[PDB]
Amino acid sequence: MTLQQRKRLEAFLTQKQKVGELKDDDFEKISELGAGNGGVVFKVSHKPSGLVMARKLIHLEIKPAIRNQIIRELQVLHESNSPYIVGFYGAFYSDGEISICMEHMDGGSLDQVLKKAGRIPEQILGKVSIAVIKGLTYLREKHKIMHRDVKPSNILVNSRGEIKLCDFGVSGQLIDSMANSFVGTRSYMSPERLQGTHYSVQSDIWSMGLSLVEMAVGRYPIGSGSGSMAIFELLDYIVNEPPPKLPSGVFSLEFQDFVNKCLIKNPAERADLKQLMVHAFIKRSDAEEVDFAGWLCSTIGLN
Template sequence: VIKGLTYLREKHKIMHRDVKPSNILVNSRGEIKLCDFGVSGQLIDSMANSFVGTRSYMSPERLQGTHYSVQSDIWSMGLSLVEMAIGRYPIPPPDSKELELMFGCPVEGDSPVTETSPRQRTPGRPVSSYGPDSRPPMAIFELLDYIVNEPPPKLPNGVFGSEFQDFVNKCLIKNPAERADLKQLMIHAFIKRSEAEEVDFAGWLCSTIGLNQPSTPTHAAGV
């Protein structure tokens, strides 16, 4: 994904502007493809192409209507990584009880309302969550306000590696001037370690979803 965003910027002088899980594809060879389904009629009725589905991955600066750059795509990528790691859209963040349901063991989590949070009431539940949730659904503008004014999502401690956590944290810094850029991310320890590891991602993918593996699978490191 980082290489795709770099290619768009350096070769075509453009930003993607719509990085989200539904626009990140993988084939049976383990190759990651960055695409854009924004004009696809096949997703016209899906959550991914709805008002909230599109804007829920936008960076705080975009939602505020201020100037934005490729740093906005980096925020969207970081948010997508957290979602793919925990299995649901990460705003509002899961508490310890929901994390335990996700991972099958006790996990340290944050309360949706912290002492440093300006929010006076518990936010509504996300569109998708684990187990019963008595909170009312989070309204669209409540969600967008949360992205702009509340702390950014983060990966739970004790589940993922520290390098992956640090990589995501650098993508989700709210101030775009302080957020990591593409060059910094390309040399991050998480990326360097992933490039050096030999992991049969294609084989894992095919066995997981029941596909026939090509004769020449691509080897890539997983999270």
């Protein structure tokens, strides 16, 4: 960490300790923040402390006997102490749905930023790459299994110039399984399928590479039609055809090679985290003095 980084993490932890127990009645809804794959996310105000939080709701029935362990598990699963993972305030349950309260990122997600930005400049994506790598490094240490992908909608930013990942250690699907595990977990997936589900960090690197190309050109780089047929044809194209690449003559050689090494089809030849962190693009980006906060505030009109 660095001085300002640890300090901000310390400050957040102080705020977390001051909040205490989280109950639904203590929240006032301000605005909807975004629409998720598993439930909507709202900007809320925690009245007793006056803290602005992001409140994610997950529709699920949790029985009273099951409830206490589920919550206690959720508290643990969200315990992050990284400057690159979105802060976590607490989780609770009321009336057939679960609330996950986290640090409000007033810059929104990068898919939202991308929409207003059109496309995101290479030097900005340099800072994004560094944060994602360090975020993935921290997550892989804490969890053996990831449950969420690297994608623009999962990269949150703010006016302090911070770039963070959502906690990949938890998903709405996992929580469902946890609730089911008290009745009796039944998996009918073959060993080879389960091995595929427990993907290595090489899959995260692929996702980062594809996301970087998407954000650099302002569009998901592999086009597809609508309907079931077009969906299958897209996935088959990803599996069996050459990966997408940046439009030639636009971006630096370093950034070009960086995303190409992330998108190599063979995961054994695909670059790993160590190789990426010392890549020419990363070393150049780390040296660059980039005003991310300034660009962000000008782009989405933060101030």
